[PDB]
Design a protein around this ligand. Sequence first.
Ligand SMILES: CC(=O)N[C@@H]1[C@@H](O)[C@H](O[C@@H]2O[C@H](CO)[C@@H](O[C@@H]3O[C@H](CO)[C@@H](O)[C@H](O)[C@H]3NC(C)=O)[C@H](O)[C@H]2NC(C)=O)[C@@H](CO)O[C@H]1O
Ligand SMILES: [Cl-]
Ligand code: NA
Length: 129
Amino acid sequence: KVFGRCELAAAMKRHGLDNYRGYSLGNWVCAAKFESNFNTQATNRNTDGSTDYGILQINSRWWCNDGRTPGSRNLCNIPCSALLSSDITASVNCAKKIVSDGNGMNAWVAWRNRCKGTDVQAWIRGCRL
Ligand SMILES: CC(=O)N[C@@H]1[C@@H](O)[C@H](O[C@@H]2O[C@H](CO)[C@@H](O[C@@H]3O[C@H](CO)[C@@H](O)[C@H](O)[C@H]3NC(C)=O)[C@H](O)[C@H]2NC(C)=O)[C@@H](CO)O[C@H]1O
Ligand SMILES: [Cl-]
Ligand code: NA
């Protein structure tokens, strides 16, 4: 599923991401835009053999199990395929765990390079909400 900008914003707010750990809704919408272009089915292979999954490109080395990343961990205790559903519930719960681990949203490289410090409130402009 390719979400619309305001559609994803309302979904993220309903699942409790608005201001979670002090990060406003626009930050999460911006991060999703540059990580996956709002496509829930996005997948990307890393050089170390791990894979990134879903709307927020969560990594298999630490957070989920895909059965093909030898030596990995599974801190969200969930199959990586569950992060590709049209329903973003699993991705949001895991992202809540990730952002609390110590380095905040710097866990997402695209957020650090393209969203951090910018006028992120623009990403929720025009949405009823
Ligand atoms: C969205 C996503 O999956 N991003 C991936 C990053 O999570 C990952 O970076 C590494 O993440 C781990 C787990 O959060 C970091 O470990 C933590 O380190 C801090 C101190 O910096 C400490 O508070 C924690 O104890 C420790 N957690 C543990 C041990 O469970 C680690 O610092 C990150 N490594 C880096 C930044 O080099 C990167 C790299 O694998 O991939 C992203 O896709
Ligand atoms: Cl980047
Ligand atoms: Na794993």
